Design a protein around this ligand. Sequence first.
Ligand SMILES: *[C@@H]1O[C@H](CO)[C@@H](O[C@@H]2O[C@H](CO)[C@@H](O[C@H]3O[C@H](CO)[C@@H](O)[C@H](O)[C@@H]3O)[C@H](O)[C@H]2NC(C)=O)[C@H](O)[C@H]1NC(C)=O
Ligand SMILES: *[C@@H]1O[C@H](CO[C@@H]2O[C@@H](C)[C@@H](O)[C@@H](O)[C@@H]2O)[C@@H](O[C@@H]2O[C@H](CO)[C@@H](O)[C@H](O)[C@H]2NC(C)=O)[C@H](O)[C@H]1NC(C)=O
Ligand SMILES: *[C@@H]1O[C@H](CO)[C@@H](O[C@@H]2O[C@H](CO)[C@@H](O)[C@H](O)[C@H]2NC(C)=O)[C@H](O)[C@H]1NC(C)=O
Ligand SMILES: *[C@@H]1O[C@H](CO)[C@@H](O[C@@H]2O[C@H](CO)[C@@H](O)[C@H](O)[C@H]2NC(C)=O)[C@H](O)[C@H]1NC(C)=O
Ligand SMILES: *[C@@H]1O[C@H](CO)[C@@H](O[C@@H]2O[C@H](CO)[C@@H](O)[C@H](O)[C@H]2NC(C)=O)[C@H](O)[C@H]1NC(C)=O
Ligand SMILES: *[C@@H]1O[C@H](CO)[C@@H](O[C@@H]2O[C@H](CO)[C@@H](O)[C@H](O)[C@H]2NC(C)=O)[C@H](O)[C@H]1NC(C)=O
Ligand SMILES: *[C@@H]1O[C@H](CO)[C@@H](O[C@@H]2O[C@H](CO)[C@@H](O)[C@H](O)[C@H]2NC(C)=O)[C@H](O)[C@H]1NC(C)=O
Ligand SMILES: *[C@@H]1O[C@H](CO)[C@@H](O)[C@H](O)[C@H]1NC(C)=O
Ligand SMILES: *[C@@H]1O[C@H](CO)[C@@H](O)[C@H](O)[C@H]1NC(C)=O
Ligand SMILES: *[C@@H]1O[C@H](CO)[C@@H](O)[C@H](O)[C@H]1NC(C)=O
Ligand SMILES: *[C@@H]1O[C@H](CO)[C@@H](O)[C@H](O)[C@H]1NC(C)=O
Lengths: 40, 340, 240, 46
Amino acid sequence: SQSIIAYTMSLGAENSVAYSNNSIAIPTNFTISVTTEILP
Amino acid sequence: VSMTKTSVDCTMYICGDSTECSNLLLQYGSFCTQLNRALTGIAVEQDKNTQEVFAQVKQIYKTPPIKDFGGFNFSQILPDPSKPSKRSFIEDLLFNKVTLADAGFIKQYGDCLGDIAARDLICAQKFNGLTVLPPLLTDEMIAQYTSALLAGTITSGWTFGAGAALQIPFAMQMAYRFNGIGVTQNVLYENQKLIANQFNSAIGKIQDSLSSTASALGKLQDVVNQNAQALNTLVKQLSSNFGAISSVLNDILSRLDKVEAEVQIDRLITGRLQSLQTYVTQQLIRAAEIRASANLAATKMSECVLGQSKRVDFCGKGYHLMSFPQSAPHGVVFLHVTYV
Amino acid sequence: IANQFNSAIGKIQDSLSSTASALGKLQDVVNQNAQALNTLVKQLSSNFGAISSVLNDILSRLDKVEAEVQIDRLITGRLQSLQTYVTQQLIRAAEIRASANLAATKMSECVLGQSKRVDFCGKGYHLMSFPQSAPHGVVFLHVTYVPAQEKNFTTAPAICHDGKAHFPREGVFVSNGTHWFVTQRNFYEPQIITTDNTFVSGNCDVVIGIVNNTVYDPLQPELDSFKEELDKYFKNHTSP
Amino acid sequence: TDNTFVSGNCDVVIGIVNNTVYDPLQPELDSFKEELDKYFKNHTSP
Ligand SMILES: *[C@@H]1O[C@H](CO)[C@@H](O[C@@H]2O[C@H](CO)[C@@H](O[C@H]3O[C@H](CO)[C@@H](O)[C@H](O)[C@@H]3O)[C@H](O)[C@H]2NC(C)=O)[C@H](O)[C@H]1NC(C)=O
Ligand SMILES: *[C@@H]1O[C@H](CO[C@@H]2O[C@@H](C)[C@@H](O)[C@@H](O)[C@@H]2O)[C@@H](O[C@@H]2O[C@H](CO)[C@@H](O)[C@H](O)[C@H]2NC(C)=O)[C@H](O)[C@H]1NC(C)=O
Ligand SMILES: *[C@@H]1O[C@H](CO)[C@@H](O[C@@H]2O[C@H](CO)[C@@H](O)[C@H](O)[C@H]2NC(C)=O)[C@H](O)[C@H]1NC(C)=O
Ligand SMILES: *[C@@H]1O[C@H](CO)[C@@H](O[C@@H]2O[C@H](CO)[C@@H](O)[C@H](O)[C@H]2NC(C)=O)[C@H](O)[C@H]1NC(C)=O
Ligand SMILES: *[C@@H]1O[C@H](CO)[C@@H](O[C@@H]2O[C@H](CO)[C@@H](O)[C@H](O)[C@H]2NC(C)=O)[C@H](O)[C@H]1NC(C)=O
Ligand SMILES: *[C@@H]1O[C@H](CO)[C@@H](O[C@@H]2O[C@H](CO)[C@@H](O)[C@H](O)[C@H]2NC(C)=O)[C@H](O)[C@H]1NC(C)=O
Ligand SMILES: *[C@@H]1O[C@H](CO)[C@@H](O[C@@H]2O[C@H](CO)[C@@H](O)[C@H](O)[C@H]2NC(C)=O)[C@H](O)[C@H]1NC(C)=O
Ligand SMILES: *[C@@H]1O[C@H](CO)[C@@H](O)[C@H](O)[C@H]1NC(C)=O
Ligand SMILES: *[C@@H]1O[C@H](CO)[C@@H](O)[C@H](O)[C@H]1NC(C)=O
Ligand SMILES: *[C@@H]1O[C@H](CO)[C@@H](O)[C@H](O)[C@H]1NC(C)=O
Ligand SMILES: *[C@@H]1O[C@H](CO)[C@@H](O)[C@H](O)[C@H]1NC(C)=O
């Protein structure tokens, strides 16, 4: 039941930003993340 | 940011439709594969360069429908929903100042033969095995990434690069941007009408300049011109003798036998093969120039658009506030806002 | 913060233990240099129009005057093979020098420093990085503060208190819905709006979107408690 | 005294000039000296 499919690629999840002339979002908490980057 | 993706049918370039020449060409071995592998390595990375520059958000931010940005009028650089491709007004100027040749997008002979075979250099390139492929991202997909980066920048400031997008009022973002350049944040709030009018007037001068001059995108037209001149030079190298009785492969095989032709055809293979080697050497060297430009453009995207840059004269001449990306044919355009 | 770094380093081990394609940037550079030597070796098998690809089989069959017409083909084709290889390697080497110069810039600016350059040292606000060697390369373990649990707040550019307009020294103003606070921009830690948290410039009328609140002067109850110290000393000395 | 910080004395800083750094606490206490003095002048009465 597996087959090769062809599609127009998605660019990313759509997000309307909840902007208003007096609304701010501030982080009540954080994540420390470690990301590996590999260079020749 | 990128350049045209050529792929060259090395046996049809050297030996167009001939068996005798294809059986002679085999005696040079790996060369036609080495050329196609090398050109595939250039064609594969034009999509790397365009992806590294534009695909710096995995989330397509959409603007609010209401434009309460505190006087700053991005309607000139934001998408126009009325258009069949949803690019902005300044992008529709940039897309007309650079005149592309063959975006890869389908040929059906009716246009490549008859009235359109004659003048059209692109059919002469194709009929000798020289083929141009389409980019992975269409001009509509590049406009959607540019739209996400801009809709992110105006609504969210730098915060959409560092993590999840956090909304902040635009005149409140500009107060952070003023503290960035060591100016106190009240110097915005006590002058906000003036700062908005100066921004709107300065974008008015971007529209006017791009609408007026014939030469502004010269850095991009000079890439289209170099690719088109290199394919035209590669086509003209088919008209040379290299010391054979004719340049034309069928004029040898319709005049000379299975042993006089081998002495002639091997000249044309030697000179044609050196012509492909010279082309792919130039195109590999060239592709390193475009790579270096794309890695710079991805850095100006990362540091001027997703951020604010304390690096002097990196993001235009002045104290950097912010930048807006705009796409162009085979490139990117930054509108760098600066306090002077 | 220590538990999150220790947990995130534990995911570096698990990722490198699990997935095949991650170090693809280094393996692709081995595979190009090996494929180029293997292509250069396979090109010795080519005739280039001589009677053999094998140089000693020409010299085993032809005399000097007939052999040099064959050997010269092989010289011409094999010297074109080396010039092609050395051209490919001279072009390639500039890809690796540009990457070595980037890795040297990431060493200086991400390892020996802290980078304010956005997304240079991984997606986040850079805290630090650690170098790790890899075959023909380097791996940087970029540590970044990423903001996580954001809640929306009402905000204002300025506060009015005394006809004067007040602005954050460092931070931004926010309201929970009933009370106004000042807070640092990158972590919600709310504080009472005071004359120590805020600087003054001009009157209310010039600021777009300014709001009314009451800015605490922490000197005032420290003097008003001194007024009750003064006034009780006054009432007592009425008595004698 | 809120705009500026102090360090050492005049003899070391090449090109230092004379002026008078306002202390915004000082007249807020001198007006408290008048709030003090008026109560003493009233207390001469009873
Ligand atoms: C906005 O934030 C305000 C500060 O956190 C908050 O007001 C505070 O509410 C608490 C109760 O949740 C009060 O706590 C005191 O309540 C009485 C006061 O007489 C005492 O019996 C208790 O022991 C306790 O000390 C705080 O006094 C009060 N703070 C202030 C400055 O009034 C608001 O409720 C928050 N509003 C929203 C919309 O969330
Ligand atoms: C942050 O807020 C936006 C909208 O602002 C609030 O919207 C109301 C619901 C109310 O809380 C008001 O006091 C604020 O003005 C949120 O955007 C909403 O997202 C939902 C889906 O989650 C969507 O159905 C609504 O249409 C959106 N509303 C608007 C006006 O855009 C956003 O989700 C909030 N984010 C978080 C994490 O709570
Ligand atoms: C901030 O987020 C962290 C997670 O990164 C929270 O830590 C977790 O807290 C819950 C209980 O609330 C535990 O069940 C988890 O095991 C904790 N995780 C870790 C890594 O210790 C933290 O409590 C949050 N802090 C605040 C103030 O919201
Ligand atoms: C932002 O600027 C644009 C022009 O660049 C304004 O749009 C114009 O508005 C007038 C008046 O309604 C129309 O007659 C023009 O035809 C509009 N031009 C375009 C291209 O749409 C827009 O109104 C400005 N926004 C604000 C808030 O002032
Ligand atoms: C592929 O060929 C078909 C013809 O078979 C093209 O379809 C024609 O398109 C024109 C323009 O819209 C119409 O006027 C014709 O009547 C169509 N004919 C048919 C049979 O469909 C089609 O446009 C071609 N596609 C490409 C990409 O070249
Ligand atoms: C902030 O406070 C000021 C002063 O209390 C308000 O201004 C007053 O507005 C009323 C109604 O128009 C007038 O009758 C007063 O004479 C005004 N006084 C001053 C000093 O302006 C102002 O309206 C308040 N603003 C908000 C948003 O609440
Ligand atoms: C700044 O003020 C100080 C003090 O008023 C000056 O120093 C005085 O100079 C005079 C003249 O030489 C002496 O008679 C005083 O005894 C000095 N006072 C002290 C405390 O040393 C100083 O000259 C002034 N400098 C300038 C540039 O005006
Ligand atoms: C903000 O926008 C609202 C409409 O959503 C409007 O009523 C208000 O006057 C605006 N205020 C400022 C300070 O721009
Ligand atoms: C009043 O002042 C006298 C000093 O004259 C002191 O001894 C006494 O404790 C004071 N009492 C009060 C209630 O202040
Ligand atoms: C500055 O230069 C003038 C001469 O133009 C000299 O008299 C004066 O003493 C100098 N002052 C300082 C602080 O160097
Ligand atoms: C003095 O104090 C009395 C109360 O004991 C008060 O009524 C009066 O107004 C005060 N007068 C002055 C000059 O302080």
